[PDB]
């Protein structure tokens, strides 16, 4: 499975061996980045004036003069040919030659190559990643990894703009990077250049920018410092701000100044990009002058970013026609998936889908805003690279599978199992959801429908669920121990623990449904209770961020089914045995609508609360915004949002 799939491919059902002895033609005149790749592939072999001809070069090179007609007349285009007599790797331009090589590397398997002819080129001009999320910025080693991933997948763009980098956003956007951070950035650029990726350095000055000379010069002085570190594409971001910095006329004037006094004055600047304050349709004023002012006043070479009809949305024909009419150019898409910075307790490891596959002509660029989990984001990133290169041939599920097998070949099926039950976002203020656990959803649905109704469930459905839980535990245990991609395993570990606990709880609950006798039922019930407590422990100790602390997994279908089945069987047991077992499904150590614990807060889900111990009280916040600082007073009982903060 070639990824991205090429525009045109003709395969002969013949394979040839990779020439053990070969004549290379054009090694001295082709893209050195492409030639490096080729010479690594041809490692172990040796060249001569004998052997298979291999021709590498860009249109215009002597090496590829016979193939000039077959080379696509497109930026980043290439012609690739393999037959018994010779190999051709001919780019329309230097980056095209590199992309030819990236396709060639995927064709090569077990020292053999298929007989193929390929004509290829991207449908979207700029394709890549914006590191543009709130939360812990990717680590240096993670970025190094990413840039290499992008080159392999023909993504040409890496926009650097972590909202939490103080030298990117306010107030320190004015300050040059300290020496250590500067030397790292410089290495990120060298690496990007070697992989044919434009490193795009963004700045985010809008929250405290003054529309005066001092700040304009400070901004240009910063761009200059970044240029000295080797940066050659630049962006100015005005997203998620208030106040003077939201002025569309001043924004355009600043971007035009940067364009005229800096971008068009240097010998070798490439992209100049801005993101607006009104960056999706819902946050745009139909009756306001913001987007029309930007569209009219911004110089036509400047790109304008857009997230769709909502902050989190997929791109539609009608959606993009709507933006393009106002900005008078094709939107450069900022796609908010798999970014999880507003559902920080979820991993979003599902396929990439939802974007119209017929609108390449209506976009200048397509970039994904990913999770703070860099390795985990590669599933979506690989799929986005495939989508933006050849949207006409984009295959959601095949590309997801390909990505997983690329990222974790040693445990691909186990990562598939984990990813397919870790795709949805749960309820959220952005209203964006993804499908999850689709395969078992019917069997789950019928089981619970019947079971809740004294109608007898299908045996095959009970077995499907059983099989699912078994497969979940195998996957969790194997992923935990996997050392092929240690950084990936580190990222997902807390969710993996939680996913295993979930599957164990599922199995125990199914044993309760079968329930041979009263004694056995009670043992399974007590085990479930202890498993609930364990999941609570994980949720309270892992991923304790300020915003959505903890660890949620398999939330759309599997956990609800388990929880509901549990409540149901406990109800039936209590009826049958005149008992009073507690049917509640989430462990809660405090007593009182469910209570919840978030960090050092104890809250009622929006009379009297009794904590498991005496704590120093911090304050209470009630909203029917009422508040009272508790001054460290010892508290166990509180009687009257409804949130209690304690020292913990
Ligand atoms: C032109 C779009 N700019 C945007 N800025 C914010 C980002 O930093 C967040 O990561 C994203 C998802 O929460 O939400 C918005 S979209
Ligand atoms: N060349």
UniProtKB/Swiss-Prot annotation:
Belongs to the glycosyl hydrolase 84 family. This is O-GlcNAcase BT_4395. The keyword Hydrolase applies. InterPro entries: BT_4395-like_hel (IPR049478), Glyco_hydro_b (IPR013780), Glycoside_hydrolase_SF (IPR017853), Glycosyl_Hydrolase_84 (IPR051822), Hex-like_dom2 (IPR029018), HEX_bac_N (IPR015882), O-GlcNAcase_BT_4395-like (IPR048162), O-GlcNAcase_cat (IPR011496). GO terms for molecular function: [protein]-3-O-(N-acetyl-D-glucosaminyl)-L-serine/L-threonine O-N-acetyl-alpha-D-glucosaminase activity; beta-N-acetylglucosaminidase activity; identical protein binding. Disulfide bonds: none annotated. Changing residue 240 to A: 99% decrease in activity for pNP-O-GlcNAc. Pfam families: CBM32, Glyco_hydro_20b, Glyco_hydro_84_hel, NAGidase. Optimum pH is 6.0. It comes from Bacteroides thetaiotaomicron (strain ATCC 29148 / DSM 2079 / JCM 5827 / CCUG 10774 / NCTC 10582 / VPI-5482 / E50).
